[PDB]
Amino acid sequence: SHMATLKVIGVGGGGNNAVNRMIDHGMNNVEFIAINTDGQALNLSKAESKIQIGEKLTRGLGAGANPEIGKKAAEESREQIEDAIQGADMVFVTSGMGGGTGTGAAPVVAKIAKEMGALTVGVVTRPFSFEGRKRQTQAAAGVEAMKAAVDTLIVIPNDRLLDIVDKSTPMMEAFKEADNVLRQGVQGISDLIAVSGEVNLDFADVKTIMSNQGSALMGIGVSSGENRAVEAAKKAISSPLLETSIVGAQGVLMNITGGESLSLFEAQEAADIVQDAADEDVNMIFGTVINPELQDEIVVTVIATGF
């Protein structure tokens, strides 16, 4: 009966990069919106919906690292941003904090989306330490503004990308690894909404776990063979890229997809991995999907909140 309208919105350079790479990767049933002050970057966006903000302010340039320009640009294009969001049931706002457009404009976009009734998730990066202390301080203020404007917020410190590269990894490949946090969180929700589960979870459970919560973790894990349930759950909660780990979570939506071999015992093992790692008494919302096209693969999806 109900089919949730999901929109992913990139705000600023880094956010629009993410959107372009997610669109290249292929993702259906999601509307993408690109928002920027910088008209040069926007002309190259792959998104179906493009909103140039603050053209009277910047004359079509970026914000020159000034968050106040990004914020005033978003406020002045409020109506345009509302028109783009209208109809959304859920909005993901992604941006790199520390510059001028994303720092300043991404919390305004998030606010508008929450004010229109949408479940609003932010997925933002913090700058590398090598970008300097001022960039980090501006980013921190952006992160705080984002937290005040979203239902849930996922922060990716870009320094963590230095933990997963070797000395030759291309920068673009490291950036794709961070893109995965948003992409797989969105796909997980889209999949949860679209399939009926044998123990069914739907968009109302997502709203319950995510609405007005603060920090979150969104993770997916796939494994096969022996101990697949424990291994997939461990993968779902363990990302080296997250500021907010699973430790401390007090609400968890956990969906397990498997073939007809999916055992009750391994569903409990998987739930216990999450609960034990949270180190809290977790209020779990537990789902199960039987996909017979799967043989030996099991997929664990986790959304964690209540920190």
Candidate ranges 97-105, 202-210, 222-230, 294-302; the one touching K ion (CB under 5 A): 202-210
Q: Does 185 interact with ligand GDP (rule: CB under 6 A)?
A: no
Which of 20, 120, 158, 257: binder of ligand GDP (CB under 6 A)? 158
Q: Does 14 interact with ligand GDP (rule: CB under 6 A)?
A: yes
How far is the C-alpha of 220 from the C-alpha of 175, rounded, in Å?
A: 18
Which of 31, 131, 202, 205: binder of K ion (CB under 5 A)? 202
Strands 297-305 and 251-258: antiparallel
Would you say 16 is a known binding-site residue?
Answer: yes
Residue 84 Cβ, how far from ligand GDP at the closest point, in Å? 18
Residue 147 Cβ, how far from ligand GDP at the closest point, in Å? 18
How far is the C-alpha of 291 from the C-alpha of 197, rounded, in Å?
A: 9
Q: Does 175 interact with ligand GDP (rule: CB under 6 A)?
A: yes
Q: How far apart are the first and last CA of the chain?
A: 33
Which of 8, 73, 85, 102: binder of ligand GDP (CB under 6 A)? 102
Closer of 184 and 250 to ligand GDP (Cβ): 184
Q: Does 17 interact with ligand GDP (rule: CB under 6 A)?
A: yes
Candidate ranges 49-57, 114-122, 171-179, 198-206; the one touching K ion (CB under 5 A): 198-206
Would you say 131 is a known binding-site residue?
Answer: yes
Residue 252 Cβ, how far from K ion at the closest point, in Å? 17
Would you say 13 is a known binding-site residue?
Answer: yes
Q: Does 10 interact with ligand GDP (rule: CB under 6 A)?
A: no
> Amino acid letter at 61?
L
Partner interacting with residue 107 (select from ligand GDP, K ion, none; CB below 5-8 Å by kind): none
Closer of 12 and 251 to ligand GDP (Cβ): 12
Q: Does 122 interact with ligand GDP (rule: CB under 6 A)?
A: no
Are the beta carbons of 66 and 100 closer than 8 angstroms?
Answer: yes
Would you say 96 is a known binding-site residue?
Answer: no
- Chain contacts with K ion (rule: CB under 5 A): 200, 202
- Chain contacts with ligand GDP (rule: CB under 6 A): 12-14, 17, 62-63, 96, 98-102, 125, 127-128, 131, 135, 158, 175, 178
> Residue positions in the annotated binding site for GTP?
13-17, 100-102, 131, 135, 179
